[PDB]
Design a protein around this ligand. Structure first.
Ligand code: GTA
Ligand code: MG
Lengths: 724, 729, 103, 358
RNA sequence: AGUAGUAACAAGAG
RNA sequence: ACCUCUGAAUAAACUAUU
RNA sequence: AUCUAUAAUAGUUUUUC
């Protein structure tokens, strides 16, 4: 008998065994070399989707720009970016007419957000494309470099600390004739002076790379990293789009998890109830083909212009900057290529900046065609990409556009016997169509498809299907008269997370508990998951039981600790103790779970604030998944690859930054608890605080006049040093 | 002194002086997050890779003096190599496990105080009581539940301001504590933490764990309080329920809320029984709320609620015929009402349904800071006489009275983005939303309410829209002044009459809202779902029909009258709209009778779907039904008579009946099932013969079949986009 | 927050084709009212741009086409159904003794 | 540490990477060109992968996993969970897929630890597994040896070369196409007994050069999640039946074996197995997903899930309709190139289509 | 050779 | 050639925990 | 009855020829 696991679906409905279709136990696919090929493919495809548009040369950067707006109406079902501006404006108008006041109230909330947001909002995130180095940097590091460069060039409006003032500084930098930077090499500092067009090309540039560890995709794809100049504008536009989306029932963003599932189920059931019993109902499990390569920044500018009608001019300008910068964007080509000589047995890296005027004999046929197609667009080492939204940006504004198209499906707008509605999340959608008969269903689907074509939305025919309402798929959630559990999606979360011993134990037990609550993880499987996690935890951290003879480097110390302990159950698993977790106590931290079983001296050593592994007191170092800090809350080593580069002065600079920050925290105790705000310098703020505190201590008699005078003398000395 | 000396030291060095001068306080956060780049992408892989290294762990440079370089076996515990970007050194995990057995020992006596929440969890689990495990048809519902209760009358921002005031008095900025709750908690924690010897940051984190509320959406069954949410993995499953009571002390407001929920469920279920009083009594004696018998709670709980008072009166207890509305205790001195749903258009152009109380009534309002006498008619305030304490108390009383009056002016006074659905599209109580909106800013409400001259009666003062004591003109029908349980008898139909003989309460006065309990409500009887939510009621009713299909089918064939009178259908009948119960019952009984007289037209699924609707006393009308409505969380969910439905879909491939998305069980094919496509339980007086037949002209609708006569075959658009041939017997 | 200079020039090139300045486009949008634009565009659009629904019957789907070529070869990191083990009776738990000694 | 001999230097790919130079100093080289970035060579589905999966689903005579301890049971639900977990562990510890899990976890753990510890050394790594026989006595097994090459791994995809020497009794000449990557030796004559007599069979050593990366080694070390993936689905089915039966059906499923699920096919037709058979089959499927992880598998799974959903909608009488079904088929078939596991999955999908539409 | 798959590794840098 | 260093951080939303 | 704290970390989701 040949074993056929797929035959299980003959009796178990596919949604009820959907976990079997996710092979998430093996390693995900990765990208090995460069991303230049994928980036060039994306640029060529984006320009191909708009090839019948109008070509212009940008007067400020010189980049050729393709404009598909108001292009010819398509005659086939191929993807295209020929969105009609009047159709988009009419969709926005009807969305506003069906939900009166949505844009006005969203604009009020966004005005409050714009006026109140601080500059350090930009540090939230992993990487930002640093134009001063032509590569990705940590968001805080990129922001610090940009601020230092702006200060050296007399652009100091960001000293207010507000994000909008930083955006004003960006706008002012756009008008500087020359921007100066500083470069390091093999470690001295050199000044480089960009010109206006060079800086403008750098500021409009988004970095590109490949996406690693992506599930369900046979082929790799390119992704983007926004630069420092555009991040604030994108944040403000997305804040407005979020305010709009919060007021829309069809929106799939920004609600996630159980709240999202409940909202979607309620919306679907409301649609079912509003449907007459004497009419057919069909749901479309729909995807869109190349949503971000067909949507145009000019249409987003039009949407923002319609949304911000009757608003103050400054608000309209600050919202409009982002689509304007996105319609003049450049794309970094990437690493380039590597060339291999078989006879001479050598390999070499070809930078992407040489692809403008490199001989085409080296490349193969497909890459040569890519380079030939993209060479007219190449400028200053980047590619001109006017059409398209690059990658994972303006998702909620895309949701707004999709919801407007869905909203166009009321009977007041269709003006016929059919109507539609559904769900929208960025580009993914689900559509419910009602009609007296099948002809009406076909007509409604056709009208939805053609309206989407008008606004530049192409429904992926090969990835969409339609059936009677009751089952659909939306944003990887499988609905079979209700959302079903999908355990395989959370399966990679089980295991040793890799923070430290205490945090990893907490993560393991919390993941088991959360999957019991949410993903229908049964009690027996929860116990087995706990056993497997304990096994992996003991193997990973070399913390097997003391009464075992697993030969590790740590086994002798654990044996010694086990021998001298009286109450073995009190030892943590990190110390070789037993596992006391079961279903009933998954929610309890380990140190608290076995606190009363510990020896007094072992407990005193474990929870000793004067231990070197963690920076009547308690152990404190950012204590995620670590309720009680012990000696097991240590911090692993950082990567040392930067010591071989020219950026190794950043280590000394950050050491001095940490020193100054800790000294400041010595003056403002609440600084760590809540982020301090202020335009004054650190030394000035500290001196003022010291003076007021010394005066108060003298007044209340906590210190004597001699100490007050000494503090005043030291403050005067610091003031003297401050100027010089 | 040490701080200023260290600052003077840093200002002497060139680079530190540059950092201290050129960096503002706003940019201090940016330089604090400043880093060379922690190249962490796959932390699990990185940890597995680093644990194979000699020294994967960093430690402060004091370890070279606090821990020896080598242990007894000579294994190295630390190295002098410094970590990147710091002066910390590289150490082995052997150093940590050596410290845990040889390091200096300190006194860990303050740890239970600092981490009181986790040890509180430990104590609650330690003293908890486990009951039996019941395998049931669980119906979980995604709802917002609290995982960290925090403090009752506080929000996250208010709690943070209180914490800043308590721990960092000189860093509060411009905030001034206004709410009396904030002042009380601040004084209490300042006194409790006076002369405390813990680090201020740790104290702030303790107060955050103690005072900051946190709520999340979870698929929850049973109680939604924090003590039950923290053990939700333990107590609730997909097919089982574990009876459990936390060992701590239960908050009394949770008890009040759960008692209200249970009383409402019990009263609504009892209203449809033959003898409501006996059913209510036997249900109250079988109900537990958080491990406590319901009767004991009723005997020791002073909760002002209609269903709670009906439950009390049924047991001979004295009741106070009162209720709560917007923080005030209302009591109807005289008058009567009948509820009526009326659709209204809000000021911000929103359409919503409001339960409108008809009739003229008089009330007395009692609050912690104000008192009023209220007289009203249908959506019209006759007069209001407030005698509050200060300006804000009288303002709040006036706002509450205006919202209670359901005045169309109040509805049209709504401005801004006032939402009447949840963030998860769950319908909210309109009155509560209006209260919360007008308690934030009521200038527009007072402006649009109107004005009225006063006649200077008894010296009672007038009130102006900007809250001033005028003596000439006042708000329309508003006047300003200056500053008990009763034995009852309850009828067989739960009608509560005072000793004189006047009616005080009735089942119709019980709210139709279907809420959820803070504390798990355990019901012990044959049907453990008898007082459960509508989804569980529907699923369990159809599963009960499925499991008992043999004898139910036999009874339906032989003695339908006793089958229709089963007590199991009564929780279902509590969901059918009251006005339509008789019509649905009569229609379904006629369908069943036709199904019996037409042999071979025996559709098992049709009988199972339509049986629970026949449990009501039948009313005979000629109206046809294509669908029957069932109230589920306020929205009438239709069950389509022919074909599948959102509530009731039967899958012929799996033979598995699914209700509201919950599996209810698998049917088995009867030998007498009609494998001929002939239907007799779809139209009240018409028998479906087959598919479309063009010979008999165009298709018509179900609602126009009266003109047809005996044997007149016709085509009807019955069902979802289908046309079939029907004939009249 | 004023758009001037380079930003103004970029804004003047971020519009639909028939607009020359951002002020003109803003004036057009501010005075815009929906006047049968979508209906007219739908009438102009050809009937070949449609989403025709093809029924998925039991006779509709076809078997997947597996590629033709030389037969596939084993690629696992170790043998699975052909592995041979030389076993000893060692009363020790998982990973206790020295691997080389056991080997 | 093995001596860096010529045979090991060849077998472990020593000095096989070309010298990294500058484009300035080599641009004039005649054959200098872009790396070979062609598509994978297509391969056809062979019968041995189905036999491998059939053998991975079987019941062994030894227990292959020694699960750790948990806290004592206090709640009644904890006792019910312990009973169900006893059934699950009895089913899953005696499955060949569990032996594969343990073997892979040990091999990948040893490889990763050696790779980090000895960057520039050739380490000899025995392939060791532990089991408990039917009579409960511990037993240590040796499958063969692994020699690790250098492991100066910078990226997560950087390859460390290793040589795998593994004992076997399978003659490589019966299915030569399966062992194209191997050099098979004959190192001895092992004496087996069938029923009563001693039979002499050759003992082969399957030697090949292979490679892996840090990410692959990590996901091999984490191979014990296949147990969770199989058991969660099994318990979901059990609890789904218990919900409508209003009682625990674990014992009824595992002992009475009354409820069966179609799990395979024979010349007669579809064959149905018990709950334990389904558990072992799902475990083997998850284990093979772990052992044969490839982008082709990911693409095929994601693209064929849609077709499964469409077929399910057809079976539910929901009148499903497509728009570009041929496009969906092309997207699915784009992922069927040369991976035996994906080709077997495609054959399974074809069989499912044949059975699900008649 | 092998891993692998649209581009890489089969050590890199000083 | 010895020697020395090093083993590699997309966006948005969400979820979990602190 | 309502109910997006702030921040940090990890995880999850988001495909043309
Ligand atoms: O949490 C819910 C409930 O448990 C809680 N609650 C109720 N009672 C108490 C007490 N006594 N202490 C603490 N908490 C309590 O408040 C929540 C109520 O939610 P919900 O059930 O959705 O609201 P309810 O259905 O009770 O309606 P509500 O708007 O709150 O009104 C309550 C009460 O007022 C009656 N009523 C309103 N109006 C306008 C009336 C009228 O004009 N004439 C008469 N006779 N009654 C009127 C409502 O019908 C209810 O009886
Ligand atoms: Mg989709």
């Amino acid at each position: 008998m040949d074993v056929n696991p797929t035959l299980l679906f003959l009796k178990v409905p596919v949604q009820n065994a959907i976990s079997t279709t996710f092979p998430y136990t093996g390693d995900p696919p990765y990208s090995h070399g460069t991303g230049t090929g994928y980036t060039m493919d994306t640029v060529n495809r984006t320009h191909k989707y708009s090839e019948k548009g109008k070509w212009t040369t940008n007067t400020e950067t010189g980049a050729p720009q393709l404009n598909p707006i108001d292009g010819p109406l398509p005659e086939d079902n191929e993807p295209s970016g020929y969105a009609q501006t009047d159709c988009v404006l009419e969709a926005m108008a009807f969305l506003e007419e069906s939900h009166p006041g949505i844009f006005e109230n969203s604009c009020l909330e966004t005005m409050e957000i714009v006026q109140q947001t601080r500059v350090d909002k930009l540090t939230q995130g992993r990487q930002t494309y640093d134009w001063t180095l032509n590569r990705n940097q940590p968001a805080a590091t990129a922001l610090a470099n940009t601020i230092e460069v702006f200060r050296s060039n007399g652009l100091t409006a960001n000293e207010s600390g507000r994000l909008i003032d930083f955006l004003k500084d960006v706008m002012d930098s756009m008008d500087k004739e020359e921007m100066e930077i500083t470069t390091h090499f093999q470690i001295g500092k050199k000044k480089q002076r960009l010109n206006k067009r060079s800086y403008l090309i750098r500021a409009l540039t988004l970095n590109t790379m490949t996406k690693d560890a992506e599930r369900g995709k046979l082929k790799r794809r390119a992704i983007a990293t926004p630069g420092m100049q555009i991040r604030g504008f994108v944040y403000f536009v997305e804040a407005l789009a979020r305010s709009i989306c919060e007021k829309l029932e069809q929106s799939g963003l920004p609600v996630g998890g159980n709240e999202k599932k409940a909202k979607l189920a309620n919306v679907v059931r409301k649609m079912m109830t509003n449907s007459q019993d004497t009419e057919l109902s069909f749901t479309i499990t729909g995807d869109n083909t190349k949503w971000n390569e067909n949507q145009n920044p000019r249409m987003f500018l039009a949407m923002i212009t319609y949304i911000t009608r009757n608003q103050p001019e400054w608000f309209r300008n600050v919202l409009s900057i982002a689509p304007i910068m996105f319609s003049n964007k450049m794309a970094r080509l990437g690493k380039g290529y590597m060339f291999e000589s078989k006879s001479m047995k050598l390999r070499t890296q070809v930078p992407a900046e040489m692809l403008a005027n490199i001989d085409l004999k080296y490349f193969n046929k497909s890459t040569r065609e890519k380079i030939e197609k993209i060479r007219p667009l190449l400028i200053d080492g980047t590619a001109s990409l006017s059409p398209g939204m690059m990658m994972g940006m303006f998702n909620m504004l895309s949701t707004v556009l999709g919801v407007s198209i869905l909203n166009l499906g009321q009977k007041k707008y269709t003006k016929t016997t059919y109507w539609w509605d559904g769900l929208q999340s960025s580009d993914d959608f689900a559509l419910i169509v009602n009609a007296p008969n099948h002809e009406g269903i076909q007509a409604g689907v056709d009208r939805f498809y053609r309206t989407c074509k008008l606004v530049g939305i192409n429904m992926s025919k090969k990835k969409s299907y339609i059936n009677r309402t009751g089952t659909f798929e939306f944003t990887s959630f499988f609905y079979r008269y209700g959302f079903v559990a999908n355990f395989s999606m959370e399966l990679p979360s089980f295991g040793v997370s890799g923070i430290n011993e205490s945090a990893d134990m907490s993560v393991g037990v919390t993941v088991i508990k959360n999957n019991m609550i949410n993903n229908d993880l049964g009690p027996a499987t929860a116990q087995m998951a706990l056993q497997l996690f304990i096994k992996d935890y003991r193997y990973t951290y070399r913390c097997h039981r003391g009464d075992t003879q697993i030969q590790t480097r740590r086994a002798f110390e654990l044996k010694k600790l086990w021998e001298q302990t009286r109450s073995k159950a009190g030892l943590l698993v990190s110390d070789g103790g037993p596992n006391l977790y079961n279903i009933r106590n998954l929610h309890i931290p380990e140190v608290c779970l076995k606190w009363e079983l510990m020896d007094e001296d072992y407990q005193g050593r474990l929870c000793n604030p004067m231990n070197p592994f963690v920076s009547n007191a308690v152990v404190m170092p950012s204590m995620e998944y670590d309720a009680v800090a012990t000696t097991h809350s240590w911090i692993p080593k950082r990567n040392r690859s930067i010591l071989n580069t020219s950026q190794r002065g950043i280590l000394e600079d950050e050491q001095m930054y940490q020193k100054c920050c800790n000294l400041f925290e010595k003056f403002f105790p609440s600084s760590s608890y809540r982020r301090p705000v202020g335009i004054s310098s650190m030394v000035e703020a500290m001196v003022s605080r010291a003076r007021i505190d010394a005066r108060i201590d003298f007044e209340s008699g906590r210190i004597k006049k001699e100490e007050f005078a000494e503090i005043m003398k030291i403050c005067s000395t610091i003031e003297e040093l401050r100027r010089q | 002194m040490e701080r200023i000396k260290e600052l003077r030291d840093l200002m002497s060095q060139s680079r530190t002086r540059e950092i201290l001068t050129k960096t503002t306080v706003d940019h201090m956060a940016i330089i604090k997050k400043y880093t060379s780049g922690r190249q962490e992408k796959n932390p699990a892989l990185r940890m597995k890779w680093m644990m194979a290294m000699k020294y994967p762990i960093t430690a402060d440079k004091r370890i070279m003096e606090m821990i020896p370089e080598r242990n007894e076996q000579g294994q190295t515990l630390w190295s002098k190599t410094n970590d990147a970007g710091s002066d910390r050194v590289m150490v082995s995990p052997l150093a940590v496990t050596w410290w845990n057995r040889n390091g200096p020992t300190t006194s860990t006596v303050h740890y239970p105080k600092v981490y009181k929440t986790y040890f509180e969890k430990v104590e609650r689990l330690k003293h908890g009581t486990f009951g039996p495990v019941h395998f049931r048809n669980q119906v979980k519902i995604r709802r917002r539940v609290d995982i960290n209760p925090g403090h009752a009358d506080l929000s996250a921002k208010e709690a943070q301001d209180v914490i800043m005031e308590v721990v960092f008095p000189n860093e509060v900025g411009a905030r001034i504590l206004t709410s009396e709750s904030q002042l009380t908690i601040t004084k209490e924690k300042k006194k409790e933490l006076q002369d405390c010897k813990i680090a201020p940051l740790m104290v702030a984190y303790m107060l955050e764990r103690e005072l900051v509320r946190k709520t999340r959406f979870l698929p929850v069954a049973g109680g939604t309080s924090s003590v039950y949410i923290e053990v939700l993995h333990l107590t609730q499953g997909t097919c089982w329920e574990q009876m459990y009571t936390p060992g701590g002390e239960v908050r009394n407001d949770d008890v009040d809320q759960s008692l209200i929920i249970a009383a409402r469920n019990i009263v609504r279920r009892a209203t449809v029984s033959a003898d409501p009083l006996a059913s209510l009594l036997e249900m109250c004696h079988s109900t537990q709320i958080g491990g406590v018998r319901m009767v004991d709670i009723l005997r020791q709980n002073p909760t002002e609620e209609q269903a709670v008072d009906i439950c009390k009166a049924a047991m001979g207890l004295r009741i106070s015929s009162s209720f709560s509305f917007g923080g005030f205790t209302f009591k109807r001195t005289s008058g009567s009402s009948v509820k009526r749903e009326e659709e209204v258009l809000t000021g911000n152009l929103q359409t919503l349904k409001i339960r409108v109380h008809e009739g003229y009534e008089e009330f007395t309002m009692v609050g912690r800071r104000a008192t009023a006498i209220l007289r009203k008619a249908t959506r019209r305030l006759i007069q209001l006489i407030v005698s509050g304490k200060d300006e804000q108390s009288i303002a709040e009383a006036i706002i509450v009275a205006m919202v209670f009056s359901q005045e169309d002016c109040m509805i049209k006074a709504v401005r801004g983005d006032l939402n009447f659905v949840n963030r998860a599209n769950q319908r909210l109580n309109p009155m509560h939303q209006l209260l919360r909106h007008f308690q934030k800013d009521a200038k527009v409400l007072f402006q649009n309410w109107g004005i009225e001259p006063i006649d200077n009666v008894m010296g009672m003062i007038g009130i102006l829209p900007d809250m001033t004591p005028s003596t000439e003109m006042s708000l329309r029908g508003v006047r300003v002044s200056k500053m008990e349980r009763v034995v009852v008898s309850i009828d067989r139909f739960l009608r509560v009459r005072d000793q004189r003989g006047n009616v005080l309460l009735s089942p119709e006065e019980v709210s139709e809202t279907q809420g959820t309990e803070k504390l798990t409500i355990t019901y012990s009887s044959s049907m453990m779902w008898e007082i459960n939510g509508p989804e569980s009621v529907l699923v369990n009713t159809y599963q009960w029909i499925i499991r008992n299909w043999e004898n139910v089918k036999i009874q339906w064939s032989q003695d339908p009258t006793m089958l229709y009178n089963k007590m199991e259908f009564e929780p279902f009948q509590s969901l059918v709209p009251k006005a339509a119960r008789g019509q649905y019952s009569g229609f379904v009984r006629v369908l069943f009778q036709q199904m019996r007289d037409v042999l071979g037209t025996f559709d098992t699924v049709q009988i199972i779907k339509l049986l629970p609707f026949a449990a009501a006393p039948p009313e005979q009308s000629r109206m046809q039904f294509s669908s029957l409505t069932v109230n589920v969380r306020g929205s009438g969910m239709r069950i389509v008579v022919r074909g599948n439905s959102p509530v009731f879909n039967y899958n012929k491939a799996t033979k598995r009946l699914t209700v509201l998305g919950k599996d209810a069980g698998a049917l088995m094919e009867d030998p007498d099932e009609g494998t001929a496509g002939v239907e007799s339980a779809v139209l009240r007086g018409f028998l479906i013969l087959g598919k479309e037949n063009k010979r008999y002209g165009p298709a018509l609708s179900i609602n126009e079949l009266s003109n047809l006569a005996k044997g007149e075959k016709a085509n009807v658009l019955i069902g979802q986009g289908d046309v079939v041939l029907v004939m009249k017997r | 927050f004023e758009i001037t200079g380079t930003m103004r020039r970029l804004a003047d090139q971020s519009l639909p084709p028939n607009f020359s300045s951002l002020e003109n486009f803003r004036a057009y949008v501010d005075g815009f009212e929906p006047n049968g634009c979508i209906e007219g565009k739908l009438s102009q659009m050809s009937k070949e741009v449609n989403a025709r629904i093809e029924p998925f019957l039991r006779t509709t789907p076809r078997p997947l086409r597996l590629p033709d070529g030389p037969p596939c070869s084993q690629r696992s990191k170790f043998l699975l159904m052909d592995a041979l083990k030389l076993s000893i009776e060692d009363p020790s738990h998982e990973g206790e003794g020295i691997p080389l000694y056991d080997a | 540490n093995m001596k860096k001999t010529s045979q090991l230097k060849w077998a472990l790919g020593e000095n096989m990477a070309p010298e990294k130079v500058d484009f300035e100093d080599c641009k004039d080289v005649n054959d200098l060109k872009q790396y070979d970035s062609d598509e994978p060579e297509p391969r056809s589905l062979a019968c041995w992968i189905q036999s491998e999966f059939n053998k991975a689903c079987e019941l062994t005579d030894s227990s292959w996993v020694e699960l750790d301890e948990i806290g004592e049971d206090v709640a009644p639900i904890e006792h019910i969970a312990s009973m169900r977990r006893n059934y699950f562990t009895a089913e899953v510890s005696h499955c060949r897929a569990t032996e594969y899990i343990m073997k892979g976890v040990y091999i990948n753990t040893a490889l990763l630890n050696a790779s980090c510890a000895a960057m520039d050394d050739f380490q000899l790594i025995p392939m060791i597994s532990k089991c408990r026989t039917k009579e409960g006595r511990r037993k240590t097994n040796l499958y063969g040896f692994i020699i690790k090459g250098r492991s100066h791994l910078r990226n997560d995809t950087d390859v460390v070369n290793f040589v795998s020497m593994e004992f076997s009794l399978t003659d490589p000449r019966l299915e030569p196409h399966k062992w194209e990557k191997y050099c098979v030796l004959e190192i001895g004559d092992m004496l087996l007994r069938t029923a009563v007599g001693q039979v002499s069979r050759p003992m082969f050593l399957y030697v090949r050069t292979n490679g892996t990366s840090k990410i692959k080694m990590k996901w091999g070390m984490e191979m014990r999640r296949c147990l969770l993936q199989s058991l969660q689905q099994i318990e979901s089915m059990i609890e789904a039946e218990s919900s409508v039966k209003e009682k625990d059906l674990t014992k009824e499923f595992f002992e009475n074996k009354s409820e069966t699920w179609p799990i395979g096919e024979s010349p007669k037709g579809v064959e149905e197995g018990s709950i334990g058979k389904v558990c072992r089959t799902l475990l083997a499927k998850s284990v093979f997903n772990s052992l044969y992880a490839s982008p082709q598998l990911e693409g095929f799974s994601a693209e064929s899930r849609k077709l499964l959903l469409i077929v399910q909608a057809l079976r539910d009488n929901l009148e499903p309709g497509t728009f570009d079904l041929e496009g969906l088929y092309e997207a699915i078939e784009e992922c069927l190139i040369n991976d035996p596991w994906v080709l077997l999955n495609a054959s399974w999908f074809n069989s499912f289509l044949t059975h699900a539409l008649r």
